[PDB]
Design a protein around this ligand. Structure first.
Ligand SMILES: NC(=O)C[C@H](N)C(=O)O
Ligand SMILES: NC(=O)C[C@H](N)C(=O)O
Lengths: 294, 294
């Protein structure tokens, strides 16, 4: 698809819906006393996105900034924790992410650029955040019925599956998605160092959409203790130097217990519009493995 | 400032103000039927930021995406025009920009990463957009008086000066800002190819804050005709090759007349908080010429 073909697509309704979704979600958080932060795109530190069952172990793209190697934002997870450490209590941000995954990840819900609504809560536990996301989704699905005139999932009860039980019953998260008619949770997933692990139990959670639409939100309680964090980094084969300033703050004892999640905005627009491929809801597609012409 | 130094600051008040500003500005536009788009950060094309009297002629940060050179967003100007070409009529986006300006631009209002509330309106004229920005600013200042209990400029409309005359009377926009006690407009500034020029008159506008706070918004009517656009790019010594997909769309006759502006969110936060340096209102400072540690 050349440049003219890209801008000749019809996208009005999707953008109409996206506008209503953004209005709804931003107000959801400000109404609850969340502070609205602005994103950062370049930093010496960023989400490693590894280890992770849902990743390929890609390294973030880098750019020289005044002679210093900066990483482009994989996710603002580390900066969220730092905002909690500055005492901002409850924060969210509409955060663009850059994740240069291969053609293999071009499954209809992945995009190499996209936005999470990314939020974090000092002192929160996994059950608090899951309950919060459930309330957000329920409210959204009820509004969406008014906007579209179509029926959406009842959204009051979300079943919880342990990761290992997902592997046992369906084989993978994608296949579970294809089999459900209601959104559901997957919990206890071994991944990045920042998610809290206690006695071999990971205090994290992915919200999965039904009808094969796949993951739409992921989060967890966080590690905040330097010793615990460093061990996990070293064990995964990541370099401590890659996280130097974060680890300094960890060492100073300035990280606080917290929990949060990110919600993929375009993935929600896709679900509500009912689009087969997420590119259909983006004015300027960013398809994995395909460098955008515009 | 080093890592622990940065997270030790108390910017709670500034962030609380920012939250109220973002809520007010986003509602302003959605109330008026604007569509809310998400930002792009990587593209083959971006704003050249040249010619421009406010600039020193910086080159965009660049990174490879699947072997293809992409530019980090200087601004989404060209994409705003493309959004109008897709028939979205009235659009805005909370758009992060990366502008790696020199230490010479560390004047208290510049940041090498920042967000513009960037909007565009099909068919609009400069007077229309100026009037819309006046409505937004006046309304925001009344709300700010309630939030802070302090007084803000009360003008409902702002005086208008030609760029040429500013130079003659004050020497510079910076010096003009220091002498004024309400916001004011500077119009007719020869700059980038995308601003509409007619018979030597540029249909563009900068809103300047008083008390030395400087520019807070810049905008213009746009060029839409292929031949005019190419001539301007060539006259400035820029390369058509740098805008190829955009120029394909212009050649196809698909750009439409429009007008718009971007408004610096952090710059407005700084003004309402009364901060000497914009860094004081940012959780993760991005000072021109100084690579941030986080
Ligand atoms: N993987 C991610 O993007 C992190 C996620 N946003 C979280 O809050 O944990
Ligand atoms: N200088 C810029 O970033 C362009 C501005 N946002 C406009 O709309 O004209």
């Amino acid at each position: 698809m050349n440049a003219v073909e890209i801008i000749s697509r019809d996208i009005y309704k999707a953008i109409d819906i996206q506008t209503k979704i953004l209005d709804y979600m931003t107000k959801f958080f400000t109404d609850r006393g969340f502070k609205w932060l602005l994103p950062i795109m370049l930093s010496p530190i960023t989400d490693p996105l590894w280890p992770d069952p849902a990743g390929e172990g890609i390294r973030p793209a880098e750019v020289d900034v005044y002679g210093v190697r900066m990483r482009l934002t994989h996710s603002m997870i580390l900066h969220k924790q730092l905002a909690i450490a500055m005492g901002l209590e409850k924060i969210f941000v509409l955060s663009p992410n850059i994740r240069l995954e291969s053609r293999r990840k071009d499954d209809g819900r992945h995009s190499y650029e996209f936005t999470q609504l990314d939020f974090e809560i000092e002192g929160a536990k996994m059950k608090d955040v899951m309950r919060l996301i459930e309330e957000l989704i329920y409210g959204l699905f009820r509004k969406a019925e008014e906007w579209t005139g179509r029926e959406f999932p009842r959204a009051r009860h979300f079943k919880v599956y342990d990761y290992k039980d997902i592997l046992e019953e369906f084989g993978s998260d994608e296949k579970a998605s294809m089999e459900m008619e209601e959104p559901f949770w997957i919990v206890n997933i071994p991944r990045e160092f920042y998610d809290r692990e206690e006695n071999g139990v990971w205090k994290n959670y992915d919200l999965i959409l039904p009808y094969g639409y796949g993951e739409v939100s992921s989060g967890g309680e966080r590690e905040w203790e330097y010793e615990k964090i460093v061990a996990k980094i070293r064990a995964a084969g990541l370099k401590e130097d890659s996280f130097r300033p974060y680890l300094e703050i960890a060492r100073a004892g300035k990280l606080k217990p917290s929990a949060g999640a990110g919600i993929g905005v375009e993935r929600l627009v896709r679900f509500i519009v009912g689009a087969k491929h997420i590119a259909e809801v983006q004015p300027f597609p960013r398809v994995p493995g395909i460098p955008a012409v515009i």
